[PDB]
Design a protein around this ligand. Structure first.
Ligand SMILES: *C(=O)/C=C/NCC(=O)CCO
Length: 268
């Protein structure tokens, strides 16, 4: 009963492909299950996206008001819909992209980062600047969530995104003030209750960014801290391609994979 066997039973039971990665630490081996297989980013890109915007600009740029119209809202945009008439600051947009996975907000940030038509390449660029040669973004919201299985476009791997996240929240990719903005937004994420959060004890701190898409895609990327402040990164990615484009994703698959992880991490 190694951990791969547990993860395998999750795949059989949920009729799903599961990718897990937890980086090695000074005292823990890496946990890897299909860690180098590709999976669609879905909204998980929005956390490194906010880092890219933060990194490239002074903090005052978060005060810049971005105006848009209803025609820009071509995907699920719970916060952009409430502020359509009055606009949103760059900071508000980072907030919305992360905490509510707002589609329009991510697209506007992509435009800020690389101009219209340059955003996805510029975001991909930021990942390469962090030594991630694997991940790629090619489309905006909503198309990015809708590539077919096996399409390399708009994919990362659990391994690659976990190491990106580690550098962003736990290493020195961002200065401490910008880093804390990113961390705070992910800590107050509202979409992640039934995924990695549900598999860690309440006294562990969890920050995360979810992703959901076609072919039953459900992702979550988290940084967690043990009750005495020991940090770990957890990438949990999944799809259910057998049910077709409209396949229902299963959040409980992620909660279980995360419970497996937490079980290993919390035991002495
Ligand atoms: C971030 O992952 C946004 C995803 N939007 C598409 C869906 O959520 C598909 C089903 O709602």
């Amino acid at each position: 009963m190694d951990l791969a066997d547990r993860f395998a039973e999750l795949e059989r039971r949920y009729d799903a492909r599961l990718g897990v990665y937890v980086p090695a630490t000074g005292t823990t081996a890496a946990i890897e299950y299909r860690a180098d297989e590709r999976f669609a980013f879905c909204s998980t890109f929005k956390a490194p996206l906010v880092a890219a915007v933060l990194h490239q600009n002074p903090l005052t740029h978060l005060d810049k008001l971005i105006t848009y119209t209803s025609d820009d809202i071509r995907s699920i945009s719970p916060v952009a819909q409430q502020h359509v008439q009055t606009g949103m600051t760059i900071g508000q947009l980072c907030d919305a992209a992360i905490r509510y996975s707002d589609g329009t907000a991510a697209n506007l940030l992509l435009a800020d980062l690389g101009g219209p038509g340059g955003g996805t390449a510029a975001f991909t660029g930021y990942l390469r600047s962090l030594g991630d040669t694997v991940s790629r973004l090619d489309a905006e919201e909503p198309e990015l969530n809708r590539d077919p299985p096996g399409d390399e476009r708009d994919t990362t791997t659990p391994h690659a995104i976990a190491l990106v996240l580690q550098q962003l929240v736990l290493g020195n990719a961002l200065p401490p003030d910008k880093r804390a903005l990113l961390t705070d937004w992910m800590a107050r994420n509202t979409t992640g209750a039934k995924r990695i959060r549900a598999g860690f004890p309440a006294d562990w701190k969890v920050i995360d960014k979810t992703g959901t898409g076609d072919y039953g895609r459900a992702n979550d990327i988290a940084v967690v801290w043990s009750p005495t402040g020991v940090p770990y990164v957890v990438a949990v990615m999944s799809d259910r391609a057998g049910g077709g484009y409209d396949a229902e994703p299963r959040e409980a698959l992620l909660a279980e994979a995360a419970t497996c992880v937490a079980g290993v991490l919390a035991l002495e």
